[PDB]
Structures are given as C-alpha cells and as structure tokens.
Amino acid sequence: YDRGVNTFSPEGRLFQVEYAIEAIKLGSTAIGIQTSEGVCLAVEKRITSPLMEPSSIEKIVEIDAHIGCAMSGLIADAKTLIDKARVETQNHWFTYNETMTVESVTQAVSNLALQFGEEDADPGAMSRPFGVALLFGGVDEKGPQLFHMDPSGTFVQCDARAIGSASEGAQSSLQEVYHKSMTLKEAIKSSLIILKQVMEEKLNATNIELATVQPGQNFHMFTKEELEEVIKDI
Amino acid sequence: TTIAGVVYKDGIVLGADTRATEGMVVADKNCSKIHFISPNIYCCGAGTAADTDMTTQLISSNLELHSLSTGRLPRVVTANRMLKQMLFRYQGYIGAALVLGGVDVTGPHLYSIYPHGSTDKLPYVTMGSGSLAAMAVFEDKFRPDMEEEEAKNLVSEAIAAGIFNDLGSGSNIDLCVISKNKLDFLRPYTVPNKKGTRLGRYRCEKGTTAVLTEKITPLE
Amino acid sequence: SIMSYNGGAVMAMKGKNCVAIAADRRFGIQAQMVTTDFQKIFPMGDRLYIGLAGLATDVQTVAQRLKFRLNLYELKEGRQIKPYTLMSMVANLLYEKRFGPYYTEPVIAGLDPKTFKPFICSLDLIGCPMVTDDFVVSGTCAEQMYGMCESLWEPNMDPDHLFETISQAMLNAVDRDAVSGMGVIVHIIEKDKITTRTLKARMD
Amino acid sequence: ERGYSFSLTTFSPSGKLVQIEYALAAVAGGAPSVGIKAANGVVLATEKKQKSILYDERSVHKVEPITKHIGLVYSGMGPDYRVLVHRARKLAQQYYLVYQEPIPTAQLVQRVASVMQEYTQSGGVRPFGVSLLICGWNEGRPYLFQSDPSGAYFAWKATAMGKNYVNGKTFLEKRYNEDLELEDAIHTAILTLKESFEGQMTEDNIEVGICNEAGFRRLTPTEVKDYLAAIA
Amino acid sequence: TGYDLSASTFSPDGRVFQVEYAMKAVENSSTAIGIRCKDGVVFGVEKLVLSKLYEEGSNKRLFNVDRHVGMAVAGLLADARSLADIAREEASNFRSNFGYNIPLKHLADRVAMYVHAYTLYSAVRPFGCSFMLGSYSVNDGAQLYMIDPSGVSYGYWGCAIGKARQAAKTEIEKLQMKEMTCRDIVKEVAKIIYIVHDEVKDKAFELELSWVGELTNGRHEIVPKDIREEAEKYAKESLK
Amino acid sequence: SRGSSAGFDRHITIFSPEGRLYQVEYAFKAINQGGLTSVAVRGKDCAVIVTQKKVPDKLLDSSTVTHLFKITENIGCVMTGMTADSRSQVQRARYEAANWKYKYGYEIPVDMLCKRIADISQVYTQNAEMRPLGCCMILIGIDEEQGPQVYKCDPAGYYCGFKATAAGVKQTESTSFLEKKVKKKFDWTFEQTVETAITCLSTVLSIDFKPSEIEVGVVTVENPKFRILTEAEIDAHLVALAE
Amino acid sequence: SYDRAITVFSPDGHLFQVEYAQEAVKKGSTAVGVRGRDIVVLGVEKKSVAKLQDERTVRKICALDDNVCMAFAGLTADARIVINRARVECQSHRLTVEDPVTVEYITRYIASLKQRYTQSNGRRPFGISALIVGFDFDGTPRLYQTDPSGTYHAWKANAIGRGAKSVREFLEKNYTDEAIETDDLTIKLVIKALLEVVQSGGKNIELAVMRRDQSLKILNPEEIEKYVAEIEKEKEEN
Amino acid sequence: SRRYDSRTTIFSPEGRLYQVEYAMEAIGHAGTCLGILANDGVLLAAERRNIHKLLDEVFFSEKIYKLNEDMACSVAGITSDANVLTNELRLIAQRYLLQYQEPIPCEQLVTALCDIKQAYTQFGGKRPFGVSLLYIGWDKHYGFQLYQSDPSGNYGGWKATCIGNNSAAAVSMLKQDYKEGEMTLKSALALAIKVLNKTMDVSKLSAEKVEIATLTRENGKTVIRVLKQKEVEQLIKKHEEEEAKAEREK
C-alpha cells in the first residue's frame, strides 16, 4: 500500500529492513559462544502455557553434523531458510566430497536473504525480507566458528553474540564475562548464567534449548538430564 | 482425384470428378471437390480430402472476415497468398493440391497451388491423380479467350478423359462458372456413367432372418 | 493395420424416412477374442446414433470426448443435436489430431429432430466428411460391406425391410471376415421409436 | 508492456458497479439507436449525426454485419464498437469453422457477453462503452438481443438506446404490435427515429438494416428515402 | 499529483510533466555542442571536474556508436551509456541484416522511436539524456541529428544541449557552418565552448572534442592530441 | 485555489462520473499542444494535404524537418501533436500497411489502414497502463472504384470519411472555412482543389506564408504514388492563388 | 501476473495482515482439541444450528487419513482448500514413502504452505488456525496447532476460534494427568470445556474422537446428550 | 501502480472482507431464489425482475440453468457472472463425467465451484463473483440434495433455503411450515408459493414475475421440468383459494 517493497528512507536505508530488525528484537532471546574447544548455542523457549509441548518448541536446528543454528524472530519463516541451508550444504557435499564450510553456508544464506520484491524476478519468489536473526555455530577446518547472520544480509563472524528480546545489554555483559581463552565448559557455564539472569521468567529444563558443536564430536543437543547437570552448578 | 480449371473470355470455369476413394476401393461417388469460398471464389482440392476440406473452410472463413471488414469483394490473390503461406508453414504436410479460380475487381484469375506452398497463375490448370489426362486435353483443345459454352465443353471433356484414364476418378462431373456478373455452380453437370438395374431382384421379408432379442423404447 | 489391430465393422443405411445402423460386437486383441458383448453404437441423441470402428482404445476415447463436447454444447444451446452439426463437430474433433490421429473411422446415423429426414455420414482417421444417401460402412470389413450394400440397398425402404437388409448385410459381411463378428447389434431409428436387436450370428 | 492484474471495475460498498453505470451514462450520451421485431424479421435503425457536411457521411458505416444472417448496431463509442464487432466476427467465423453451420444469434450474443464479462472482471482494461442491438435469423425465426456494457443480455422485441432512451422505449411499447409485418416494423422504427431525431432526419442521416429468412442486409439510401417518404 | 507522476498520463491540458522534468534534468547538466560542416561533424562536450584526482577522458560524454557515427550526450551519464549501447546494438543489427553500415538518418529515427517507446508506459520513465549523432558518408555527406529525451530527432546545422545551449547557438550563428572547413571549425567550437562555459559557476572544467567526416575516411574518431593543444591555444586567445 | 482531484478519474483513463474518459479527452488538446495546423482536402480526382512548415531556428537543417511521411508509395500522411508520437504512429502505419500487402497480395486501402490505426489507438484508450498516444494522423490515397480518399484517425480513435478536415490549434477555424467553401462551391478540378487547400491555410491562420514555410503532399490519378511539392510548385500555386 | 506484495512489514515489524488473519480466526467458530493418553478428541461448536440444514456439508472436522484429522477455526473456504491440499500432501507422502503418514510432518508442510503464502507475491495467507490430531506409528497421540503466521506447536490440549483464550486458560487449570485416562473422562472434559461456549450444550455441538489407529468416528448425538446429562449429574453432586 | 491499485484481494483491519460483504449486500437486493426438498423431488422458485413487455422471453428459464444431466442451478445477482459460472460448472461436470463414466455428484461439483470461487477471492486482484448459487440435484450417494453457496466460497447443505430480499423472513417461514421427512411435492410446492408471495410482498405474486422448476427421479432418470405459464397461473389460483379458505376459517 502506497509505499513499496524497494523503497529507501530519506537518510538512505530500507525502513522495511529497519522494521525487520525491530521484529528481531521482538523475537526470542538466543545466545551463542564460540571457544577454542567448540561452540555453544542456547535459546529461551518462552513457553506460553504448560499445555504446549516443549518438544515442538525448539529454536535450535541442525544444519549438518557439524553445524547448529539458533533462530530469533519469525520462527515460521526461519524454517524455509534452514531447509535451504541444509540442502545447499548437502549439495556442496555431493559435489566436492567434503562438508560445506560454515562461512560458505552463511554466505549462501545471505545470498538467499534480501531477495524479494513485487515485480523483480519470477512471480513464485519472496515478497518480504526474512525476519529472523541467525547464529550459525559450527566446527570445520578453521576450528570452531560462530556467525551472526543479520536479516539485512550483513553476515558477521563473531566469537559470541546475544540476540532477541534481550539482545543488547546482555551481549555487553556476556562480553565482559567473556574471555579469549575460555574452555567449552566455561563457555556453556557463562552462557547459561547470562541467560538465567536475563530470563523474563523462572527458567528450567523446559524453558531453554541448549546445543553444542565440538571439534571431535558432532552437533549434539543437550538433553534434560545433562541440562540439569550443567544448570545445578549455576 | 481429377480437378481442372480454365479462364475463358469472361471468367473462370472449374470442374471436378466425384470418385472419392480411400485405399483402393471407391468410398464415395458424390464428393464435393469444388469448395465455395466467396461469391466470386471457388477452389478444387485433391489429395487428402479432409485436409483439403479444412483448408478450404479456413480460407473461406478468413476471406469472409476480410471482406466483411473491408467492405470489398474478396480477391483471388489474397486467397492465393494466404494458401501459399499457410501451406508453406506446414511444409507440405497438408496433403492438399488446389486449383483456385475466381473473379475479382482486377479480373478473372486462376492459380495452381502445390501442397508445399508453391503457387502459379496459369490460364489452364489440372490437378489430382488423373491430372495428366485433363492436362493433355487442355494442351490439345485450349484457346485464348474462349466462349462460355466452349470453356464448359472443354472442361467437361478434360474431366471425362481424366475419369476414363484414371483409376481414382469418375461417377460424376461437377462444374462451377464464375464471371464478372454471374456465378453458377451446377454439381450434377453431366453423368456420363449409368448403372444397369439388377436383372434378378432378390428381396427378403421378416422371418427370413433370425433375431435373438428385441427392445422397443418408444419416443415422443 | 492399426485400425485392424482389434477389428471392426459398422454400417448405416436409410429407409423411407427411418434409419438403420448396425455394428459387430466382438472385442479382442489381434489374435484372441476377449469380450463378445462390446458396445460400438452410442447415442449422441434421442434420434441419433454413432458407430465407431478401428482401434478399440481410440473408439472409447473418441466416444467419451465426443459425448463430453456434445453434452456441453446441448446444455449451452438448449436443443437436441442436429445430425449435420454432430457430424461436423466430430470431424473437427478428429482433425484436431492431424499429427496424432485417432485410428478410427466412424459413421453417424439418425433423423432430423424436426423433419425426421434420414441422415447418414462417414469419416476417416482424420475426419473427412462423407455424406452418402444410400449407405456408409467402415471397419476392417469395408470391402465385404460395400459389396453387400451396393446390391442389397434400395431407396424408400420400410423399417422392417430395412432391418432385414441391414441384418443380412452384417451377417454375410462378418461371416466372411476373421477379425470381426461374433454377434451383431442393430438399431432401427423410426419416426417414433428405436428397436435394438442382437442377430443370431455365428460366434466363431 | 506489463499489464495491470488488478480489475479496474470494483464492487462499491452498496455492490453497484458505479464504473459500469458511468459506462451506461456514456452509452446514453452517445448517439441513439433503436431495434424492433416483426412476426417474420428484425429491423435495426440508427442515426449518424456528423459535424458539418465536410464529413463524407457515405464513407463510414455504423450498422455492421457479423454473418449473412446476423447484423448489429451500437449506441456509444465507435472505437469500442469496432473492436467488439471485429471480435464477434472472429467468434462467428470460429464457430462456423468448428461446426460447419451458421452461428445462432443467441450463442453469438452469449459469446459477446462472455467477452464483456471478461473485460469487466479482468485487470488493466476499461469496460466497453457501447450497447449492442443485435438482429439475427436462424431456424426460420427472428431474434433481437440487447447487450449492455455490464455484460448481461436480453431478448427484446423492441428497444431504444441512447438519449431519450426511456421515452423511446415507452413509445415503442405504445406503437408495438405482436403480429406486425416487416413493413409495419420499418414504419414504427422510422417513426421512433424521427420522433427522437432532433433535427430533421435525412436518408443519409438514417441507416437501417433488416434481418429475415433471406439474411441480413443494409438498406441503401434509395429505398431508405423511399420508406421515409412512404412513412412521412 | 496525477498529472506529473508517470509518463502514461496526460495533464488536464494534455501535457507530459515527466518528460518536462527529463528536459530539466538534461538542461541543468553540462554543455555539449555539435557543429556539422560541409566536410565534417564535430562535437565539443564540457566535462565537470569534480576533483583533479579524475583522469582526463574519464566519464566520456562522447560515445562511438557505429564505425562512422558518434554520440555527444548530456543529462544522466549512465542513461547516456545505456542509450549508446542501444544505438550500437541497433547499428550491429542493421549491419548484420543489410551488409553495410547503417545510415545516420535511419539510425537516429530508430533510436528516437526507442526513446519514445520508453516514454509511454508507467512501467518505465523517460530517458534523462539528450544526444546528438554525427556521421559521414561518401554519398550523403556530413550528417548531424539531435535527439531529445522525448524522442524527437531533427537534422541540425549546429546544435547545443545543456545550460548555455542557447548562448552557444546564438553566438555561433555568425558562422556559416553549412559550407565551412572541419579543421578551423574545431577551433571555433573550442572558442564557443570556452565563452559559453561559466568559470565562476564551474571553476574546474575539461573539454572532450572529436569529429567524424571525409578527413576521417568516414569513420568516427577523437581529435588528435596536437590539434587538441592548438585548438586549446586558439580558444585561450579568443577568451581575450 | 483548492485544486482538488476526483481520485483517479482525472488521472488515468477510467470512466468519469459524467460518462467521459478524461485522459482520452485530454488528447484532443494534446493535439493542440503541438502548435501546428494541418489541413487536408480532396478534389474530384485528387487529394491535397497542406501543412505549414515551422522553422523555430535556422540552426537546424530545415530540409530534414519535413513532417510529411510516405506510409507507402501511394499513401502519404501528416500528423499533429507530439512529434515523437507522430513518428511512432508513422512507423506503426508503415508496418501494418506492409503486413497487409504481404498477407493479402495488394496495397492496403486507406479506409482499412485508418481503421487498423484507430483500433490500435482504441487499444491505448482501453488499457489503463499506457499513454494514449496524443497524436492525430491524416492520410491520403487514390482508390479504384471510389476515387481520391482522405482519412483521419485520432487518439480517441473515432475516424470518418470526409471531403476535407484539419487537425491542430485552429482545426475549428479550418472546419468553418471548409463549411463556407463547400456551401459556396461544389465542382472542383485539380487546380481549384489545390487553390482551395492553400486558401484554407491562408484564410484561417493569416500568415502570408513564404514558399519554404509549408510542406504539401498530393495524390492524383495520373501517378497515384504520393508526391510532395517542392519550392517551385509551392511558389507556382502561391502566385496562382494571389493573382 | 498478479504479484503485488500483500504481506509486508509494517512499522515495528508487525505483520498487520497476520494480525487481521488472527482476527478472522478469533471471529470464526469455536473448536477445541485434547490429546488424551489413549485418544485424541476434537470438539466444534456447530453455532447457528439453523434447522433444515444438512450439517454434513458444514462439518468442520475432517479426516485426512486413517490416523490423521483436523479441525479448523477461521475462513470456511480457506479451510476447505487447505484440507484439500493436506489430503494431497498426505497421499503424496503415502505414495513416495509407502509408510503411514506422520502427524507432525503433515502439520509442518501445512505450516510451510502458510509461510509460502505469507512470503508470496499477490497472495494473502490462509486466515485459519488448525488443530491437527493424529497418531504416530507406535500409536502415540499427537495434537498440534498451527496459525496463519505459519507457526505450529504441539499441545496437550488447546482451543481455536471464538473464545479460544478463555477455553485454553480453563483447560490449562482443569487438565490433569489422571483426567484423560479413559474416553469417558476425555469426552466429559471436552464437553464441559465447550459448555461455556455453546448455549445449547448438546445440539449446537459436535464431537469427534480418534483412537490408536482405530478408524476415528464422530460422536453420536445421543451420546452427546447422555454425556451432557452425565456432566450435569456430576455438577449436581459437586 | 501502488496508489492506483484497488487491492481487492487483501485482508481488512477488522478481519472481514469488504468485497464479499458488498457482494452479499448486492445479492440481497438482487432477485429472489428459493430451493426446497421433498421426499420425491426438489423444487426451485426463481423471481425475474426485469419484466418489461418488450422482452421476447423465449428462453425456457432465465436464472435457472441445467448444470448437467441430473443437476440444476439457480443464480442470484449479476446474470453475466451467472452465465460464465454456469457454463464453467457444465464444463467441469462433463469433465467428471468423462473421467469417471458416472454422473458427477452434486457435492463434488459444489466443492469444486467453491474451491475456484475461494481462490478467485484469495488472489488474482479482481473483484469477486457477486452471485449466490443454489444447487439442486440427485446422486447415487444421497439422492435429492440441495446446497447454497456464497461468493466468499462457503457452501452449506440445506433441506430448504432462500436468497434475495427478506431472506430472514423466508427462512423463518420455511422453519415454521416445512415438514421434514414428510414434505410431499404438493405441500412443498404450496410452501414455495407461500414464500414467493410473502418474501417479496411488494408487487404481489404474479405469473410472469417468477419461474418455477421441479427436479424428480422417475424410473432411475432425473427429470427437470420447468412449469409453464399456465402452471404458474394454476399455482397462483391454488394459493389464492387456500389463503381465502384459511382466512374464512379464521
């Protein structure tokens, strides 16, 4: 209506993308920490009612055996991009007999991002930008890696990033409590305590989803017993 | 399979046989090989009869639209050019060889059209399987600016020769004369071949044949 | 040979003002007979039947598509089909597949809806109109049927003599043919009724 | 060329297609025309009021045939009438090609109505600004059809489109008979045309077509003025 | 609003304000002049030096669209480049379809038709560029057609497009350019362009000058450097 | 002073409340926007189009600004309004005439060419996504069985056959002159027809035009190819009318 | 050719079209779904009973396969087309896998369809929220709810349509593990949940139940009547 | 195009759809249609508004059409939309007949039409078909059965329903005077006459103002009979006689 999908602002930027970033902060809180011993991802589930099954509420998804992803925002819109990323990784494997690098996965996700319009391409295409911020944690030949995918397509490689409802402030506190020589146990402990502090509600094993990628082990998602084991010390 | 056309002093005389056969046995003795197109355009078709009929129908419709839009009488030329281009687009797959006769504003015209799309304006044209007999008759007894009766007799003799010297034409001759003024289309122009009656008539009555079941469903 | 792949025989002649249309009933592969009760004459109107001969699949598909477009036309227009219009429409349907022709040579028989004047016509695999006053035949039995008709048919026949003539024609044309026969179905469309009969033919 | 995919014609809050109403208003503002039925045929009449005589009123035609048995006249915009009559001619020719029989007038009017409906519900187009009076003969019967820019149609024994169209309709109702002849139909049509001509009709200013069992044919000014003289 | 939003609508009077704004966008740009003589067609275009860090000959407003046809542009330079690409594509198509170099008259007619075709639909906007095409032929002579952003092409003994176009035209009227000599006309073009250039308005400036004609063997070319300095010296002297 | 607009009724060609098409009727004055008047007449055996040649500046090659276009050998035409639109319509008319020639085997009749151009214009009027080509074309020819012919299309598309008409700023004044001339004299020869054609422009616009200030085309039944008068013929007709 | 972007981000990244679809869902009819330990039950308010009407055609509870069913809340026509598309997806999966369909997979692809209609050009999303009941291979009851925004989540019990929030807030407090042990208790829970919505209680209501791969059937009107009588019997003693 | 689009295929702030609301409102003031079910048949009563004496009225029926061999339809609203809808319905019905060699079930055909109408509302950018449809038919699975559909794409199965002016009054009359399971053709016809007289009280019941149709199943054959003008006069006379008798007994 009136304003188009390819309209900038007087200062020279897409207010549609600004609205998407606003929807990002409207999204659920997620945290990602990359260390030398792997990478960890966590997210607050934001359980509406106890009747809702915690199993279907999972913001962390496996892209490959060495890549996990944390999504914040339009979780419904994020699954299409997740499927595209997984199929692209598997195409790269099928073509080059190797696991696709996390950075290339992020670049391809950026390629898919910000590809929409009214009459600019085939009609069976996107109309709106993706409204989901992503954290791609993974392990590849460059050791553990973590990438902040911005819905703007401005992909970033970041050691640790917090996104969602409590993105800012919490990210600064995580940086302050974050060091350049932390172990994986230290990383998960710090992420868990920051998430617990920033929780809008009393959290437990049914309020958070935790996952990790290790240099040796594959992408493993923390079940309830290990979640309780790691949260009882905090 | 024996059609012919000629231009005489006034206009065009077209003629055709009637033995429409499929395979090798006669399928029909009353084929309409002289298609109407316009009140001043007729065309004789030979070859695949279905293709010829569809072609003539399409050309008649197209010239109907053209003439009714332009307020003018249709032209043999606009018909010949359309036939040429349409057949050439199909590369002769339309098994139709045509003799397009007519009378237009610029005068009487006769055209020979080949299925591949080639056309030629000739004073006298023959086409079909029995085309050679009629062509010989024309080469032998054709003159420029002939009278109406002379043209009619010449075409009749040509069709008779094609009928009697080809194994795919006969049982009737159809004639159509177009002039600056009058259009005549006499289908049973002359029937040179008759049928003797069955010397011994053999008929049957009910009870001669055996029937298993009867089902009457009266209608209204 | 594709039209003889399954075999077939259909005919239609005219009476004084009535019509007779008859067809063989054998259906099977080139070698073996599968069914002896196959229907080859289908009603395109209350006073209008159509017989089809040739490849059995093409017969069935052409009949279905014809009934499709005919019913659509008659529902849109509000009058029973005129036989000439039906014949032209089916001829156009066949011609639409000039490069993919249905290996079927049909015939159409019936009466004028208002005049009751007999009408019979024939087509080919492309759908060439062929209107002949005396009779039209089609199928693998074509030569036998033409020979029978061109001596058994007379003008201005009463319905009963018409039935006898067409019955003898089918019987004596299929008993001398190998890829057709095993029962003959005959439809006599008179001014105010239709009679459907099965002839006592040799089943082999 | 892109092509707008949103229909310019839209349902008003009351549901009335006010755009179609404006099209009918343009029809009324256009030149008037009349159509009438007899027991054995149809007569269409209309007036062609040009500017001063510098226009060759003979060169252009308003009554147009579709087939040998169907003619029509319009009230409204000539640019729309030309394309509409051209498409109707194409439809009649296609039907004749398919079924080897002349187009029934009812079916032709149905096709025209479908075309108008496609225009009215499609995007990027303008509804047609004409009303068609269609005369046809088939199966030994006359037919006269009103077709509106809204896309509907009716079989009307008599009709009058254009300026003073309601009064023309009332006048036709008063001067219409069930079993009149073609001569009476011509008398009535010319009487209505002179009652609603506004400016002393002439044989050039009146163009009439007649459709009967012999087909459809447009009367030339000779017999036109002959009938005007006989009718006074 | 409604009468100036797109090129597919008339003003209540029947005007095209989008095309008028395109005319404004081509007027406010730098000057570009083209003078045809009996033995050649010359172009002198004025280059705004945004900074001295640019190269001479950067962002040329002179394109070589055919083997013998030049193109002096004014307005949006990206749009001018696109139009030069379209012109050379049309020249290539004509050469392929007819075996010889396209004549300038038909080239300009086709290009103007294309420009006008992109001034009819709301799905596009009128070009923000005007351009003069000069060519030479053995049988035609020296030819010069100016083309508006609206899509109108006319033959011009001498034309100017830009800010000081009218002043250039008026002062060059003293020249009887229709039977003049291309070499000296180059120097006179340098003169006229120097006078019509406003130094106060644009302190920094450059000139791109070229010709096509019989001295070129009928193939479009840029001015040789030596003639460039000599014409520059003549223009400096004429500045007085 | 409160320049309100009724939505998009006055903005794109959609049906106005008064049963009008505002962007179609704007084209009538878009014809006037050109500032040029073109008047065409037909004789008993000839048709002459006379159009004043505007020379806003000597600096353009006035020998190459001729606005008379030959659609075919025997069909000439002249247009009013946007010159780019005029060129586009001339190109389209040439394309359609050639297509008719190839598809139908004879030269396109002028009435049918005008009808096709009018249908093309009605395409623009019907569609709501294109400028409706605010330009008017008038074409001439020689037709067998009907004589010399002049037709005129329009952006609206409503065309008609006519003895004489005009398009431009003073088309109404030229129309008045044609009314008075047809009511005064009827029998026209070639020289009388050309003299009346010159008299129309002279009386209507009152310029006392120079020989180079007009461009005139003629079609005659001696060489039906459309031929343009040069300065010699222009001066001859000028002095003949003056005397 | 129709490709106008309908679903665009308003200020603050709020999909106003999604909000309006949610409003249509809320204004639509009332449906509820419970996932008992053995069975799954759907209950739809047949509001405006409007006698002389064949309710079979308006039934808002439709079975997709022998182990999957759904009840919608929102637009009836969009619900019908989505049910047709879900029949297509279930049959396609059955063909390409020759295994029984999966409730979660069906709900997921329906959600993907909704998200494609939110991300598509010239299209608007499906203004319906769907409760999908079913059973997995091992007979595990499955209850999922998907919204026009495209998000789907598994629920032990929930409600959609008119009064959905009130019904779900009542169910979250009335829902206990031992209260869904048997079909009688499950039916009574659903009936007492919908009683606060339906005025008639027994004749403007319809109940469907699916057992562990046991050819789900719709509850009989006599059963509904006697079970409303039973819940009144519980009410009088409590 | 953003400003000048009509965007008729989007939502509304309050969740309704103005285009379908306006279509229904236009249908309300459009003509009157009524469908009723009897134990041996189904009856339709359609009211024609334009009744000028200039009509040729040669058609068998105006707003009542025959979708296929065993199903009839009554349209309400824009007749030009009605014609294209009806021939599309005939096309798809014959398509099902071709594909399955069985008469297309009425529920099948109604569901298909509602699918296409819903999609046309869903997208395309065009104004929806502002015509209500009322379908009657006979099938192997349910026999006599009638549905009412809406331009929004929603349909329902009814024993009897009316569309047009005074729809609530008409349906109240049906709910009051319809004998479910015990409605013969005669009593159904009388109720239909009552409704035609009452739901349009202005311009009281007239023979030429309405058209009456019946659909029955005789000898396994679906027969659709349009009651002639003499028949409609007989209905009017019977209604007048029964009303007079009821008033005199009152």
Q: Within an 8 Å CB–CB cutoff, is residue D222 touching chain H?
A: no
User: Class for domain A2-234, per CATH?
Assistant: alpha beta
Task: Check if D14 contacts G (Cβ < 8 Å).
Answer: no
CATH number at residue B32: 3.60.20.10
Q: How far is residue G167's CA from residue G161's CA, in Å, rounded to a whole number?
A: 10
Residues 155-174 of H with CB under 8 A from G: 155-161, 171, 174
Q: Cβ distance H70 to H56 under 8 Å?
A: no
Nearest by CB to F131, from E7, E169, E173: name it. E7
Q: Nearest CA to CA, how far is F211 from chain B (Å)?
A: 39
**Which of the 8 DSSP states describes residue G120?**
S
H or E stretch at H220: none
Residues 6+ apart with CB under 8 A from E195: E167, E171, E238, E239
F68 vs chain D: nearest CA distance in angstroms? Answer: 23
Domains defined for chain D, CATH in brackets: 2-231 (3.60.20.10)
Number of domains in chain F: 1
Please give, rounded to a whole number of angstroms, the shortest distance from the CA of C148 to a CA of chain D: 32
D78-99 helix and D105-121 helix, angle to the nearest 10 degrees = 130
Experimental approach: cryo-EM
Nearest CA to B6 among B133, B112, B106?
Answer: B112
Residue E159 in contact with residue E34, Cβ under 8 Å?
Answer: yes
Which residue does chain C place closest to D100, by CA atoms? Answer: C88
**Chain F closest CA to B105's CA: distance in Å?**
9
How remote is the C-alpha of F45 from its chain's centroid? 19
Total domain count, chain G: 1
User: b/e string for H7-37 if b means 16 or more Cβ within 10 A?
Assistant: ebbbbeeebebebbbbbbbbbbebbbbbbbb
Q: Please, are residues A8 and A159 in contact by the beta-carbon 8 Å criterion?
A: no
Closest CB to H55: pick one of D9, D113, D156.
D156
Whether the Cβ atoms of residue A68 and residue A60 lie closer than 8 Å to each other: yes
Interchain touch G–E (≥3 Cβ pairs closer than 8 Å): no
Which residues in chain D are contacts of B62 at CB distance < 8 A?
Answer: 93
Q: Where does D77-167 show beta strands of DSSP type E?
A: 130-138, 141-147, 153-155, 158-161
Nearest CA in chain C to H71: C75
Given the structure tokens 């053709």, which residue do they identify? H185
Cα C103-C106-C111 angle, rounded to 5 deg: 165
Sort out which chain A residues have CB atoms less than 8 A from H7's CB and list them.
1
Question: Which residues constitute the domain of residue G99?
Answer: 1-238
F212, F240, F186: which is closest to F51 by C-alpha? F212
Q: Which token pair is E53?
A: 């860090």
Give bridge partners of residue G45 from the DSSP assignment. G205
Q: In chain E, what is the straight-line distance between the N-terminal and C-terminal CA atoms, in Å?
A: 50
DSSP E156: B
Cβ distance E150 to E144 under 8 Å? Answer: no
**Residue D230 touches chain F, beta carbons under 8 Å:** no
Judged by phi (left if over 0) then psi (alpha if -120 to 50, else beta), residue E82 lies in alpha
CB of G226 within 8 A of CB of G232?
no
- Name the resolution in angstroms: 3.6
Within a domain: B214:
no
User: A151, A109 in Cβ contact below 8 A?
Assistant: no
Which DSSP category does H69 fall into?
A: T
Strands D64-65 vs D70-76: parallel, antiparallel or unpaired: antiparallel
Instruction: Specify whether the CB–CB gap between G189 and G42 falls below 8 A.
Output: no
Chain A: residue whose CA lies nearest to H8: A1
Beta-carbon separation of C194 and B219 below 8 A: yes
For the CA atoms of E23, E26, E28, E33, the dihedral, rounded to the nearest 10 degrees, stands at -120
Q: Can you read off the two tokens belonging to residue E21?
A: 């704004």
Closest CA to F46 of F192, F159, F235: F192
Of C80, D144, D134, D95, whose CA–CA distance to H58 is shortest? D144
C92, D99: Cβ pair inside 8 Å? Answer: yes
E107 vs F208: CA distance, rounded Å: 36
How far is residue D190's CA from residue D192's CA, in Å, rounded to a whole number? Answer: 5
Tell me which of B1, B52, B78, B126 is the catalytic residue.
Answer: B1
How deeply is G176 buried, as exposed, middle or buried, from its count of CB atoms within 10 A (0-12, 13-18, 19+)? exposed
CATH of the domain at F218: 3.60.20.10
Report DSSP state, residue E1. Answer: -
Distance CA A206, CA E159 (A): 80
- What is the separation of C-alpha B195 from the centre of its chain, rounded to a whole number of angstroms? 23
Q: Which residues of D touch H18 (CB under 8 A)?
A: 13
What residue ranges do the domains of chain A occupy? 2-234
**Within a domain: B201:** no
Domains and CATH numbers, chain C: 1-204 (3.60.20.10)
- Contact call for residues E39 and F55 (beta carbons, < 8 A): no
Domain residue limits at B97? 2-190
The count of C-alpha atoms lying within 13 angstroms of the C-alpha of F130, restricted to the half-sphere facing its C-beta, is 22
The 3-state DSSP class for residue G182 equals coil
Q: Does D60 contact F160 at a Cβ distance shorter than 8 Å?
A: yes
How far apart are alpha carbons B139 and H132 in whole angstroms?
A: 74
Secondary structure percentages of chain C, helix, strand, coil, to 5: 30, 30, 40
Q: How far is CA C122 from CA A203, B28, C16, C83, in A?
A: 85, 10, 20, 12
3-class state of residue C178 by DSSP: coil
Contact present, G and B (at least 3 Cβ pairs less than 8 Å)? no
Q: Which residues contact A217 (CB under 8 A, 6 or more apart)?
A: none
Q: Which residues pair with G50 in a beta bridge?
A: none
Distance from the Cα of D93 to chain B's closest Cα (Å) equals: 6
In chain B, the number of structural domains is 1
The answer to whether the Cβ–Cβ distance between B69 and D86 falls below 8 Å is: yes
Check CB contact of C130 with chain D, cutoff 8 Å: no
Direct distance between the N- and C-terminal alpha carbons of chain A, in angstroms, rounded to an integer? 51
Q: E82 by DSSP, 3-state: which?
A: helix
CATH code of the region H1-248? 3.60.20.10
CATH number, domain of G230, equals 3.60.20.10
Contact H4/F at CB under 8 A? yes
Cβ of D22 within 8 Å of Cβ of F125? The answer is no
Of C64, C65, C75, the CB nearest to H90: C75
Span E1-238 CATH architecture: 4-Layer Sandwich (3.60)
Phi, psi dihedral angles at E144 (to 5 degrees): -150, 115
Name G26's bridge partners. Answer: none
Q: G-chain residues within 8 Å CB-CB of H133? A: none
Q: Are C67 and C44 in contact (CB under 8 A)?
A: yes
Contacts of B57 in chain D (CB under 8 A): 97, 100
Which of G24, G70, G48 lies closest to G198 in space, CA to CA? G48
The set of residues, in sequence order, having a beta carbon less than 8 Å from that of C36 and lying 6+ positions away, is C25, C26, C27, C182, C183, C203
Number of CB pairs, chain A paired with chain G, less than 8 A apart:
115
For B66, list phi and psi in degrees, rounded to 5. Answer: -60, -50
- What count of CB pairs under 8 Å joins D to G? 9
The one-letter code for the residue type at C48 is L
CB-based contact D147:D134 (threshold 8 Å) = yes
Q: Quick check: F122 contacting D, CB < 8 Å?
A: yes
The torsion angles phi and psi of B73, rounded to 5 degrees, stand at -75, 145
Whether residues B69 and F115 touch (CB distance < 8 A) is answered with yes
Q: Are strands F46-52 and B3-7 parallel, antiparallel or unpaired?
A: unpaired
Question: What is the SS3 assignment for H22?
Answer: helix
CA distance B17 to B1: 7
Q: Which domain holds residue F213?
A: 1-243
At A179, the amino acid letter reads H
Q: B2 catalytic, yes or no?
A: no
Q: Is D85 buried (19+), middle (13-18) or exposed (0-12) by CB count in 10 A?
A: buried
Instruction: Check G4 against D3: CB less than 8 A apart.
Output: no
The token pair that represents A190 in the structure block: 């710090």
Measured in whole angstroms, the distance separating CA E4 from the mean position of its chain's CA atoms is: 27
Nearest CB partner across the interface for B27, out of C95, C130, C171: C130
- Identify the residue whose tokens are 């995007």: D123
Contact E145, E160 (CB under 8 A): no
Amino acid letter for position C84: Y
H-facing residues of D in 173-192 (CB < 8 A) are: 173, 176
| Minimum Cα–Cα distance from G169: chain A residue | A49
Q: Six-digit token pair at D69?
A: 């048995």
